């Protein structure tokens, strides 16, 4: 899987193909984060196969649909439990993020895992994603934004319109 | 000096240029190699086949008469279906005339 663009959260439900032994095999559900639904079903079959004696040939997808963020206008803290392969082992991490959507938080995890650990998306398994209250967060990067009277300036604002104009008479001012 | 020893590299590429053809099949396969004692009798069987020629004629004619005797004693949408009928060059030949007569 390529963690392309902003991921979506998919609810994938699958089961073993019914057989005379078991005419109604049990139903399984997973939370999948993927770029599109085609990738979402593919990853499902990759995960259930690791937990059950099942695979695409001997099973079917019963429901694939996007789970929509339920409070897209409310800031939340997300705890993420993931495992990943490094160059020389596997590890379990717990990570935290602040975001408005749970799929946005998961995307941050992939970019972050790529930035800080050079971990490609194909080597990352998001085990669990929870919304966490400010009092249960652990990472100081997230906790410093739990301040009702938070304030801070924007020092040294760099000129981003550096080629409009490309040549000017006045030098830029970085203080605002 | 020393040289290469053996390879079949490039060989299946050559074999398939004119296809790996299966052996030709004819409905009559030669009796070469069959048991000599069995073949000796099969030739004697073929040699005297003409002895029973008259009996076969009698039986064949008798069977034909019986075979003939028994035989002689024995013997999408309504709109789209209507339209497909009219558009038929033969069947709709008169239906088309009715529309032409009606139109004038």
């Amino acid at each position: 899987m390529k963690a392309s663009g902003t991921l979506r959260e998919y609810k994938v439900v699958g089961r073993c193909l019914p057989t005379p032994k078991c005419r109604t095999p049990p139903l399984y559900r997973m939370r999948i984060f993927a770029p599109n639904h085609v990738v979402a079903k593919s990853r499902f079959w990759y995960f259930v196969s690791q937990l059950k004696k099942m695979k695409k040939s001997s099973g079917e997808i019963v429901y694939c649909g996007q789970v929509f963020e339920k409070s897209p206008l409310r800031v939340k803290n997300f705890g993420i439990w993931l495992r990943y392969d490094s160059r020389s082992g596997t590890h379990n991490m717990y990570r935290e993020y602040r975001d408005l959507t749970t799929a946005g938080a998961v995307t941050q995890c992939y970019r972050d895992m790529g930035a800080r650990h050079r971990a490609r998306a194909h080597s990352i398994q998001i085990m669990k994603v929870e919304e966490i209250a400010a009092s249960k967060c652990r990472r100081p990067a997230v906790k410093q934004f739990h301040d009702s009277k938070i304030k801070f300036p924007l020092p040294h604002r760099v000129l981003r319109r550096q080629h409009k104009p490309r040549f000017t008479t006045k030098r830029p001012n970085t203080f605002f | 000096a020393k040289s290469k020893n053996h390879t079949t590299h490039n060989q299946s590429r050559k074999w398939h240029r004119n296809g790996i053809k299966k052996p030709r099949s004819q409905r009559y396969e030669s009796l070469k190699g069959v048991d000599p004692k069995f073949l000796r009798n099969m030739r004697f069987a073929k040699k005297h086949n003409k002895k029973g020629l008259k009996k076969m004629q009698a039986n064949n004619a008798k069977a034909m008469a019986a075979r003939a005797e028994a035989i002689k004693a024995l013997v999408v949408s309504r709109k789209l279906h209507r339209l497909a009928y009219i558009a038929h060059p033969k069947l709709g030949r008169r239906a088309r005339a009715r529309i032409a007569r009606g139109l004038r």
Partner: protein, 49 residues
């Protein structure tokens, strides 16, 4: 008579995809182009037809 009507049609000569590809050398589920992309073929057909 899908077999007859479909053999009747000459293979469609489609143009290069306008707007590019992702990676023709890998599967669609890898962020590439090969394989089964399901209904997503229609987006590809729009850009090549």
């Amino acid at each position: 008579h899908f077999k007859e009507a479909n053999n009747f049609l000459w293979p469609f000569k489609l143009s290069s995809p306008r707007g590019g590809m992702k990676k023709k050398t890998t599967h669609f589920v890898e962020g590439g182009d090969a394989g089964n992309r399901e209904d997503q073929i229609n987006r590809l057909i729009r850009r090549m037809n």
